Design a protein around this ligand. Sequence first.
Ligand code: CL
Ligand code: CL
Ligand code: NA
Ligand code: NA
Ligand code: NA
Ligand code: NA
Length: 333
Amino acid sequence: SLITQLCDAGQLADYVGLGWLNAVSSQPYLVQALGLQPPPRRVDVDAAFRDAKGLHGHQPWVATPLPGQTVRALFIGINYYGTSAALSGCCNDVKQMLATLQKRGLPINEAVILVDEDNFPGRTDQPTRDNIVRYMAWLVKDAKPGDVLFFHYSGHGTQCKSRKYDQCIAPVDFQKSGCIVDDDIHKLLFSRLPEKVRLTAVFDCGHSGSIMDLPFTYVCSGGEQASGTPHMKRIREGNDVLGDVMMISGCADEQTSADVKGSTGAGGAATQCITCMLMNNQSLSYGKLLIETRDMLKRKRFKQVPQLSASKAIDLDQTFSLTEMFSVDRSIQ
Ligand SMILES: [Cl-]
Ligand SMILES: [Cl-]
Ligand code: NA
Ligand code: NA
Ligand code: NA
Ligand code: NA
């Protein structure tokens, strides 16, 4: 059962109290491009699920249980301290993610936190290639109808050579162990969910645009209005995802600029998008919330606009949530 009292297993983290909601930067940070990488070691999903046996998370805070549902979460933040790859804001993104989920009362049964920041309360382990792979398997391995899964990554996205380039993420030990290709992330995180499981995945990568091979997407570009009726669009033939996967990322505005012939930051946009969506206390639809969120990113000088991708065409009139299955937009084949 979920721990419902602070006297049950002792005191738990108060991330809001450590200033992680209100007293850390929510501004853009600099993300230098990593550059083209050598070929990665492709994932053996068998070995991943084997290495995940016996892994577990911990309950990060007390909250009100959702009847008929469990919640599992994996957070990955990578600053690449001391290297040419160093990023200032990725572990801070995870701080804000954790504090926002706590503030809003998401009842997480088990969380795993992979960050390279020292003295980070609740840190499970280092975000190495092998840890990311096995804990991705951990997140999805026990999934049953009604379950809710949450995934957050803030770190480098880049390209790696094949054995045409692949999009990939860089673990903290990428220099030794190589990157993880988006196809393998899709196979670990998305492909192995059964029906009636809900996942939300947030990828905060300054230089990717990748949508993890999902079949439907919606970009909340500059010409969208609250008085319009947005829809997702199909961008890939075929689909191997049974569950309800929703992904938040940032991408370039698809509206063509009126500039003919200001300052921004590329880091932190996806995290601000999801946290802004969660902090809005008015039970807005996906569509309306993405407008407000787009406006926040342009106000705060982020380079990116919001991108929502999914395993089904979500009716954007549906109320945004982390916990509910999608209402399908039947107009999108
Ligand atoms: Cl619950
Ligand atoms: Cl609709
Ligand atoms: Na915040
Ligand atoms: Na990068
Ligand atoms: Na598959
Ligand atoms: Na700003």
